[PDB]
Symmetry: C3
Subunit: 215 residues, 3 copies
């Protein structure tokens, strides 16, 4: 049953945003304030999205794609700011991201596997672009920061590249591809990916000192 997977997701996202809110209450360093604000909004949004999916009962799920659409940009912003990335490259990441999600929604809404295949390819190309920049460009840029920031980025980088790559694969084994995995399980896996990519990521970032200004 999906309701219990959607119930838990709603819970963990809600708990994570609450916890993030508590830990950030007494933060004066403006650098940290941005990270807290950015990072707390991500899971705050997924929260409302999962709640709508939970109350939704009574395939295709717009809430699932809207969540991704609004939250992925903030996630990259976190990484961007952490490494003091250039505005152009930041703008390129978000645009590529917006394309990755929008394009993936069209595929989901398409019937002809052939067509869906094209949308899937464009989406994955967009994701690979984003990951490429995260793994390489950002790592080099992160090399000019104090070790504390460099190492925190590396962890977030690894977790992000890995977790993000699993989405199209989970999407592939679901109903839009090799129909191996039933709906409830598909919902579960995406839930695990969503909590980890948002709350997991947030814990890693908001617990480190990296969110604090340097010199």
């Amino acid at each position: 049953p999906e309701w219990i997977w959607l119930a838990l997701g709603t819970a963990l996202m809600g708990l994570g945003t609450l916890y993030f809110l508590v830990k950030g209450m007494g933060v004066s360093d403006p650098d940290a304030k941005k990270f807290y604000a950015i990072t707390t909004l991500v899971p705050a949004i997924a929260f409302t999205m999962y709640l709508s999916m939970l109350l939704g009962y009574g395939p295709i799920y717009w809430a699932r794609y809207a969540d991704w659409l609004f939250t992925t940009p903030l996630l990259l912003l976190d990484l961007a700011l952490l490494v003091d990335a250039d505005q152009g490259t930041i703008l390129a990441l978000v645009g590529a991201d917006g394309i990755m999600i929008g394009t993936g929604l069209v595929g989901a809404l398409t019937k002809v596997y052939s067509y869906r295949f094209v949308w899937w390819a464009i989406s994955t190309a967009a994701m690979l672009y984003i990951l490429y920049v995260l793994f390489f460009g950002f790592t080099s840029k992160a090399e000019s920061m104090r070790p504390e920031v460099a190492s925190t980025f590396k962890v977030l980088r690894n977790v992000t590249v890995v977790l993000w790559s699993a989405y199209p694969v989970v999407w592939l084994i679901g109903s839009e591809g090799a129909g191996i995995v039933p709906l409830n399980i598909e919902t579960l896996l995406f839930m695990v990916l969503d909590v980890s990519a948002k709350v997991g990521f947030g814990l890693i970032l908001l617990r480190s000192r990296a969110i604090f200004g340097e010199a």
Copy 2:
């Protein structure tokens, strides 16, 4: 009849944007330019929104929520810039705001009062968050500005906290709550709130000297 309430709203928003446009024509100070641009766009958008509601004849009103969705962020930006608020806190205000409106639209589109109640609660929590930051954080921040800017902010702060709080209450006495107030009146009250919160706010801000750079 709602048409005459929707007709007036269209008129006042249109007149306000026209007036704002005239007063800003000869402005060189870049600080003032931002305030004029920001402030003039708010009522320019509501204008087109009310016009669609007026021509719409021939409940539920998407134009009403889209107006709020696009304009509330700019309104907070005005206050944010006036007090030189931090980027993180600005980003947190807009996100909370986006959540407040989106969440309120889902409630409006929900049938089960129970469900609608939850959406209402999340929305009001988001608004209270925004107001909390406006009344306290911004006031402290406003304390570091010349008296002219400090006092103009206080007025906008008061008018905003008061006017904004009336929305959920008006929403409550309408058809989604205690069905005490009929449709035409509901439309009227929201119109009065919209004109005051946009044109009223604009007059207060664009007439003061606060919009001008300091040192």
Copy 3:
């Protein structure tokens, strides 16, 4: 037949984004990076939009307006950054732009010519506002830049004011106005306008030295 007009558009937008991507691969100057990122995203988005129109077969076209909605803002950003335009004026351009497109979509979705006429007027007023600022304000601002940047802007300015003005006229001879031009031709003309206003504009900008920082 529209498919071949929509097929070519998909091709030219795709080729342009590919070419833009190649030329920008080895760019370190952050000034140039922004221009490449901004400029490459515009045609990358139109690409996916035209592809959906092409695969769409199997009037009214949302993809056509969404393309414009998401891409016109970036186009103005290019011009804005090139002339180091003020934030307020940038914010005013995008808002006016968002209004121009949204308002034009409502007109297209309206049946009563009379109503459609009003939407058309508001949209054209918004465009004239944008052009007015581009031709005058930006030109003056461009006068404070080295001749290389001044002259590149002038060309983009001319091409933009001319190409953009042709849209409402093409819209006028189509089915929402003087039904002189059939659908396939209408689609063709808009395609020519889209490729020129995006790829054409991009070639002009990304080939010049203007995208490089100065002092």
